[PDB]
């Protein structure tokens, strides 16, 4: 058995409607369930038996389909609905086992646009002695996505950058982002100006510090 | 009623590991197919197998290298052998209800109860406690009304670390970002918090039995 969910990522404005699809490689009648998972939490049952709502789930969630094609329709989407959705089918017996999750569909909930405030943090004084130094830059409460660029004395950096993005805010649909630049102690004393540029379309914000001060 | 998984640990390639799923506020009975489910970091859900609480059923990729058992009316186990990096994941236990077919088969109706999950990390590295560094605006700047401070939690293994501020009393304005795995296999994360007028980040790393408190102040 194979559960194919297409597409892997969907988006809709707050209040709008989205449909997540799940296709089955065989005929599975009606024994399909839907699940919601937010980062760091176990999955939560939304629907089972194709369309039966679970205890406590709003009617804005709607099961559908039969046989080979099923769908989950979310009407009146809110920022709290931003998450990943999985279909699931399972059959067991003494000779044949057919179990499978779908690959999952991520929902990005489009909310009100917000430009990011940016912060740079020079390394604490006790980092340099360790041979390695880490510079953190943060982009706070924004939507839609941003891109981050690192400049050390006007030279764009391309190695040693890790970026990490929070899930969408439950009430606000906004993101937060950290961007970390790691260098060797020698590399860091070798240069002076360290700058972090966050770009959200046509707008951009830049923060900087200079090692000496 | 609730479920709690235990046993997740850092282990070397080739090792075996047993995880346990303990029930609270109910017992494993003849209406329960207890399933194990796992999720590799940033990937999708993958069914492992299930045991009838009143005989076992494994996925094709699992049958032959792991075992599910029922020890008591409160506990079931997952015994995994020859672990590899592809087994690094969160392992959940879920209580399943089935709809019988009448011909000797059963269809999974739903998983209505999930434990919070336990983390299995398969790597050759040793456990390593994080280094904690204060995040503060550069000293050569004029301080302002408000200020955002934080802690960098760097170079630890295995996950997770937990981060509180002022022992849990400080929550509004806190952003703790998702851990990122670096080239070296170690993890890192940061936590920032916004305030006006010091503050203390509390970092717990259970797997090294470590707790670190760093008091952060803006540097002038």
Author numbering:
A (entry chain L): 2 to 95, 95A, 95B, 95C, 95D, 96 to 210
B (entry chain H): 2 to 35, 35A, 36 to 54, 56 to 82, 82A, 82B, 83 to 100, 100A, ...
Can you quote the paper on this entry?
The HIV-1 surface-exposed functional Env spike is the sole virally encoded target for broadly neutralizing antibodies (bNAbs). Most cross-conserved sites on the Env spike are occluded by host-derived N-glycans that appear as “self” and sterically limit naive B cell recognition of the underlying polypeptide surface. From the Δglycan-primed rabbit displaying the broadest and most potent neutralizing responses, we isolated two vaccine-elicited bNAbs (vax-bNabs), E70 and 1C2, directed to two distinct sites of Env vulnerability.
The high-resolution crystal structure of 1C2 Fab was used as a starting model. Analysis against a 40-virus panel revealed moderate potency but greater breadth than E70, with 85% of the viruses neutralized. Further analysis revealed that 1C2 bound to gp140 but not gp120. To pinpoint 1C2 binding specificity, we performed nsEM using 1C2 Fab in complex with the 16055 NFL TD CC+ trimer, which indicated the gp120:gp41 interface as the target. As observed for both JRFL and BG505 viruses, greater apparent neutralization activity was detected at 24 h compared to 1 or 6 h for 1C2, 3BC176, and 3BC315, whereas the activity remained relatively unchanged for PGV04 and T20 (fusion inhibitor). Together, these data implicate 1C2 as having a similar Env destabilizing activity as 3BC315 and 3BC176.
